[PDB]
């Protein structure tokens, strides 16, 4: 709860890549794509819709951890 | 001579007073703001001024910590201090029951004398200082930021807030000019306040190591 | 002779650039190999690979050099205020006086979303607000503008026209920009510094 | 017949625009000749590459 | 200055004899007693007053 | 050309090409043109999905 | 006669040439001293010199005289001045981070192979940068385990 | 008001229109504006015509006269300085020799 509430570009990229890989590996879609044959485009649509079932686990340098949802974080 | 030597002595005395005030010893405002006129009234000639005895100070006491603690300052007259002078100062401090001492050398310290002073005793803490360095106060320099030795409580608060250890803080050598000016030992922490280009200040911390 | 001297100067420049290429290549290699270990953590502390902290906060404030709008400054308050006034013109709202502007600024800055912001940025905002309010006061004293809003020539209000809606929009935009221009954890700040010093 | 001017913005940085009809009428036609050499040598034994 | 022996031509050094300082060689008994004052000025170039820059 | 500098820090990869560049303002800043010849050679592994 | 004319009678032996620079600001024309020497302590200790506003270009001397923070500030200012002389500007944060990485151990350490080994610890990195075989054999002798951080 | 140039459309420093667009309305708007500029400027430039010739660099009569007068004055002053240095005493600037 102490870190920045904004979702960084690195987190955006990693989440989009992981979701695109999962979709290319026959993962279920939660946005009802309309003729999108590109897993990266599908992942971007899911990110814009705020329906990606991924939780970022931010680790502090000391060892503590904190969970942040994609729908909970702020996007740009 | 007789005009620049007295000025150097006055400036060194004022620098020592400022150093004692920064460290926390008891020093009055009159001694802090001591003018060249008063220094002349005390002694206006080089042969009349006494470097080894007339310039020594024994009233410096840590009023904030404990009035019993006493700190002494020696001003050797010879350019190079010898083992005999070091032993004389050591036995004088033993007789007077004093632990902390400073030695304001005139030109330098021989290697043997330096080693002896380093390995004198854990309880007798003697710090060497060159007059060429003391002629100018390091704290008043524009490049040198403001340093404050933090207490154990402040260090514990910092460590608890940042979830860090002692070895993880930026190191600063004990032989640093500011380190010797403040008389900080191994394990202590100093907070440094750097005035940014704006009206703000950047707070950092350094561990003596 | 003139052509020969020009050719001499040209060859001098060519050899200078040739030496510069290799010299800067070596310098950049060294700088990158030296600074490739630092990175921005989530606790706003730049640390090396071994865990040692190089800075408790990047640059003393923690702003992104790539997102720096002003000359080594986060925002240009004058430009931001002009853009806000031009983007959101409220013709159905009256102007604000010095006292009203200061009051609304103090009431809006004391909200919760402004507590997490740095103190230096809030002080700069207060200074800019005070400056613009003093300018408005001087303009109104010069042109006999009354704060009651009953002056017959309404064009005088167009000299320095400000509304609480525009004030709130300006404050929110400044806060959002200052929050988005901060150092994002995980960036190879050391490598970025090495490249920006090598180029 | 070169004309110094900007045309279609396809000559931004030191680039130039050629004429399709000029290139078709033989302008700039080049020929690249390459050589492919082969050797059929006799070894120590009484045998040869064929 | 640099003096040489008219006999052989080697360099002469200044030494002290039994009566007065004298020039003598290290390779022959030739000597030369000093009668009057002898000087060798060099006139080293003095440091000019470096004026202000700007 | 060592193992640390020549084979670990900088090494050669596949699925890459090298070609001369030419100006074309009709494309966006975030777009780049690729020739058909290099496109038919550089392939991408796509996984068959629904 | 050979070595007498080269004996110092007044001044600091380290100082070689001191000149009087003048700033002609419309408010007032002021004077300052520009010394092409390598001794800041003596220049500050000399009489009539305002030691509180004395700067030097030698980072090692600044460190040994006024401390590690003074060395950091001098490095930052010198880098900024050298970069501005060429008309190109760089954000101060880059030079600040560079100076901090150089002076986070209490001593100004360079970016060369001698100043990088004292800061870093990765045996693999030290071997890949320079002195490959030497560093590898030293690590094999010391039995130092290198992490993957 | 004003005409566009490198100071506003170039990559020199801040105050660029594309920079303001990027910092105000995101990256897509700036990219679209840059694409529109790159697609519009060439068409207008080609329809208007922009060429350079020898007449665009040839000098004028007044220019040649001024150049001749300036060269004469400079050569005269240089000869005067050379004479003052060789025969006589020349004013020596501070911090440097006569040469
Ligand atoms: Zn002889």
With vertex at residue B91, the alpha carbon angle to CA B89 and CA B96, rounded to the nearest 5 degrees, is: 95
What is the Rg, in whole angstroms, of the alpha carbon atoms belonging to chain B?
A: 19
**Helix, strand, or coil here: C103?**
helix
What angle (nearest 5°) sits at the alpha carbon of residue B28, between those of residues B24 and B31? 110
Question: In angstroms, rounded to a whole number, what is the distance separating the alpha carbons of residues B101 and B183?
Answer: 11
Cβ atoms within 10 A of the Cβ of C111, count? 10
Q: What's the CA gap between C197 and D8, in Å, rounded?
A: 38
What are phi and psi for residue G140, nearest 5 degrees?
Answer: -65, -35
- Kindly determine whether residue H23 and residue C70, on different chains, have CB atoms separated by under 8 Å: no
- CA–CA distance from H29 to each of D39, H18, H22, H24, H34 (Å)? 65, 9, 7, 9, 9
Cβ atoms of residues A71 and A48 within 8 Å: no
Rounded to a whole number of angstroms, the distance from the CA of B174 to the nearest CA of chain G is 9
Helix, coil or strand: residue C97: coil
CA nearest neighbour of G65 among B138, B109, B126: B138
Quickly list H helices, B49-163.
83-96, 111-118, 131-134, 152-162
**Exposed/middle/buried for C106, CB within 10 Å: 0-12, 13-18, 19+?**
exposed
Q: CA B59 → CA B27, B86, C39, G45, G112, distances in Å?
A: 8, 21, 51, 27, 50
Q: Does H35 touch chain F (CB under 8 A)?
A: yes
Helix (H/G/I), strand (E/B), else coil: B130: strand
The answer to whether G12 and G61 have CB atoms below 8 angstroms apart is no
User: To which H or E segment does residue D9 belong?
Assistant: none
> With contact defined as beta carbons under 8 Å apart, do C101 and C129 qualify?
yes
Cβ–Cβ < 8 Å for C184, G78? no
User: Which three-class secondary structure string do you get for F29-40?
Assistant: CCCCCCCHHHHH
Please report the domains of chain A, with CATH numbers, ordered by start residue: 1-76 (3.90.940.10)
- Establish, for the pair of chains C and G, how many residue pairs have beta carbons separated by less than 8 Å: 63
Taking CA G39 as the corner, what is the angle to CA G34 and CA G42, rounded to the nearest 5 degrees? 90
For chain H, helix (H) and strand (E) counts, in that order, are: 4, 0
Q: How many residues does chain A have?
A: 76
The data reach a resolution, in angstroms, of: 3.0
Pick the closest to residue C168 from C92, C113, C99, C123 (CA basis).
C113
DSSP letter for each residue of B160-184: HHHT--STTSPEE-TTSHHHHHHT-
In chain E, what is the straight-line distance between the N-terminal and C-terminal CA atoms, in Å? 44
- Candidates G93, G101, G119; nearest CB to C65: G93
Q: Which DSSP category does B45 fall into?
A: S
CB atoms inside a 10 Å sphere around CB E39: 5
Q: How far are the Cα atoms of B134, E51, G11, G28, G40 from residue G37, in angstroms, in the given order?
A: 21, 19, 12, 28, 8
Ligand 1 center–CA E43 separation, angstroms: 29
| Measured distance CA(C38)–CA(C185) in Å, rounded | 12
CA distance, residue A36 to nearest chain F CA (Å) = 11
Q: CA–CA separation, B128 vs B80, rounded Å?
A: 12
Note whether D15 contacts H: Cβ–Cβ < 8 A: no
Query: Which residues partner with C113 through β-bridges?
Result: none
Strand partners, B207: B171, B189
Which residues are CB-contacts of F36 (< 8 A; sequence separation ≥ 6)?
A: none
Contact present, G65 and B180 (Cβ < 8 Å):
no
Give the integer Cα–Cα distance in Å for B204 and G99: 14
Cβ of C56 and B203 within 8 Å?
A: yes
B163 interaction partners in chain A (CB closer than 8 Å): 60-62, 64
Going from the N-terminus, what domains does chain B have, and what CATH number goes with each? 1-136 (3.40.1340.10), 137-209 (3.90.940.20)
Whose CA is closest to C146, among C107, C94, C92? C94
Q: Are B83 and B104 in contact (CB under 8 A)?
A: no
């Amino acid at each position: 709860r102490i870190t920045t509430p904004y979702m960084t570009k690195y987190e955006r990229a990693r989440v989009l890549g992981t979701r695109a890989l999962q979709i290319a590996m026959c993962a279920p879609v939660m946005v009802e794509l309309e003729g999108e044959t590109d897993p990266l485009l599908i992942a971007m649509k899911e990110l814009k819709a705020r329906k990606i079932p991924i939780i970022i686990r931010r680790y502090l340098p000391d060892g503590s951890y904190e969970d942040w949802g994609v729908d909970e974080l702020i996007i740009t | 001579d007789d005009e620049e030597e007295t000025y150097r002595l006055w400036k060194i005395r004022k620098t020592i007073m400022q150093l004692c005030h920064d460290r926390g010893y008891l020093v009055t405002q009159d001694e802090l703001d001591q003018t060249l006129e008063e220094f002349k009234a005390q002694s206006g000639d080089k042969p009349s001024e006494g470097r080894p005895r007339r310039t020594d100070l024994t009233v410096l006491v840590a009023h904030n910590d404990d009035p019993t603690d006493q700190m002494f300052v020696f001003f050797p007259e010879e350019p190079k201090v010898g083992i005999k002078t070091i032993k004389v100062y050591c036995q004088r401090m033993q007789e007077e029951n004093i632990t902390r001492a400073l030695i304001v050398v005139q030109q330098g310290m021989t290697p043997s004398a330096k080693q002896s002073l380093v390995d004198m005793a854990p309880k007798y803490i003697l710090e060497q200082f060159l007059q060429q360095e003391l002629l100018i106060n390091i704290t008043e320099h524009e490049l040198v930021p403001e340093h404050v030795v933090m207490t154990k409580e402040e260090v514990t608060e910092l460590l608890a807030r940042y979830k860090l250890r002692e070895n993880q803080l930026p190191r600063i050598q004990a032989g640093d000019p500011v380190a010797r000016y403040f008389g900080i030992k191994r394990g202590q922490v100093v907070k440094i306040i750097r005035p940014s280009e704006t009206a703000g200040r950047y707070i950092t911390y350094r561990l003596v190591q | 002779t003139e052509f020969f001297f020009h050719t001499m100067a040209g060859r001098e420049g060519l050899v200078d650039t040739a030496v510069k290429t290799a010299e800067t290549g070596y310098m950049q290699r060294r700088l990158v190999k030296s600074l490739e270990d630092l990175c921005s953590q989530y606790d706003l502390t730049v640390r090396s690979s071994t865990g040692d902290i190089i800075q408790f906060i990047y640059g003393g404030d923690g702003l992104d050099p790539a997102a720096m709008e002003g000359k080594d400054e986060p925002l240009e308050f004058k430009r931001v205020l002009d853009n806000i006034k031009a983007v959101f013109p409220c013709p159905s709202e009256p102007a604000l006086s010095k006292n009203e502007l200061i009051l609304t600024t103090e009431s809006i800055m004391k909200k919760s979303e402004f507590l997490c912001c740095q103190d230096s940025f809030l002080q700069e905002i207060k200074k800019f607000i005070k400056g613009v309010s003093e300018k408005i006061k001087k303009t109104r004293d010069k042109y006999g503008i009354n704060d009651n809003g009953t002056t017959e020539p309404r064009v005088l209000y167009q000299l320095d026209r400000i509304t609480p809606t525009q004030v709130e929009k300006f404050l929110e935009t400044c806060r959002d920009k200052y929050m988005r221009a901060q150092m994002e954890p995980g960036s190879a700040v050391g490598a970025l510094c090495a490249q920006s010093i090598g180029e | 017949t070169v004309a110094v001017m900007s045309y279609s913005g396809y000559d931004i940085e030191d680039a130039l625009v050629l004429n399709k009809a000029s290139l078709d009428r033989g302008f700039g036609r080049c020929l690249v000749y390459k050589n492919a050499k082969c050797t059929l040598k006799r070894y120590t034994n009484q045998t040869f590459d064929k | 200055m640099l003096l040489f022996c008219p006999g052989c031509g080697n360099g002469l050094i200044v030494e002290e004899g039994q009566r007065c300082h004298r020039f003598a060689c290290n390779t022959c008994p030739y000597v030369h007693n000093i009668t009057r004052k002898v000087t060798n000025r060099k006139y080293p170039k003095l440091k000019e007053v470096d004026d202000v820059l700007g | 050309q060592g193992r640390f500098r020549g084979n670990l820090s900088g090494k050669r990869v596949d699925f890459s090409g090298r070609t001369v560049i030419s100006p074309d303002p009709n494309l966006r800043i975030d777009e780049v043109a690729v020739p058909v010849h290099v496109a038919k050679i550089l392939t991408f592994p796509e996984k068959v999905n629904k | 006669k050979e070595d007498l004319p080269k004996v110092v009678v007044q001044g600091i032996p380290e100082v070689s040439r001191a000149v009087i620079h003048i700033d002609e600001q419309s408010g007032k024309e002021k004077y300052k001293l520009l010394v092409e020497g390598d001794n800041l302590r003596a220049v500050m200790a000399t009489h009539g010199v305002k030691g509180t506003r004395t700067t030097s270009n030698n980072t090692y001397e600044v460190e040994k005289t006024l401390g590690i923070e003074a060395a950091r500030t001098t490095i930052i200012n010198e880098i900024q001045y050298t970069m501005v002389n060429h008309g190109m500007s760089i954000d101060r944060r880059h030079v600040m981070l560079l100076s901090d990485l150089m002076t986070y151990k209490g001593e100004v350490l360079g970016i060369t192979r001698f100043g990088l080994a004292k800061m870093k610890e990765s045996v693999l990195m030290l071997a890949s940068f320079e002195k490959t075989a030497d560093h590898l054999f030293d690590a094999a002798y010391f039995g130092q385990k290198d992490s993957v951080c | 008001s004003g005409s566009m140039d490198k100071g506003t459309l170039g990559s020199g420093s801040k105050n660029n229109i594309f920079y303001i667009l990027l910092r105000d309305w995101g990256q897509n708007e700036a990219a679209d504006a840059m694409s529109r500029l790159a697609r519009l400027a060439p068409v207008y430039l080609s329809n208007r015509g922009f060429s350079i010739g020898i007449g665009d660099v040839t000098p004028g009569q007044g220019l040649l006269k001024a150049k001749y007068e300036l060269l004469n004055a400079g050569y005269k002053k240089c000869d005067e300085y050379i004479e003052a240095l060789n025969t006589g005493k020349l004013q020596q600037q501070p911090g440097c020799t006569a040469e």
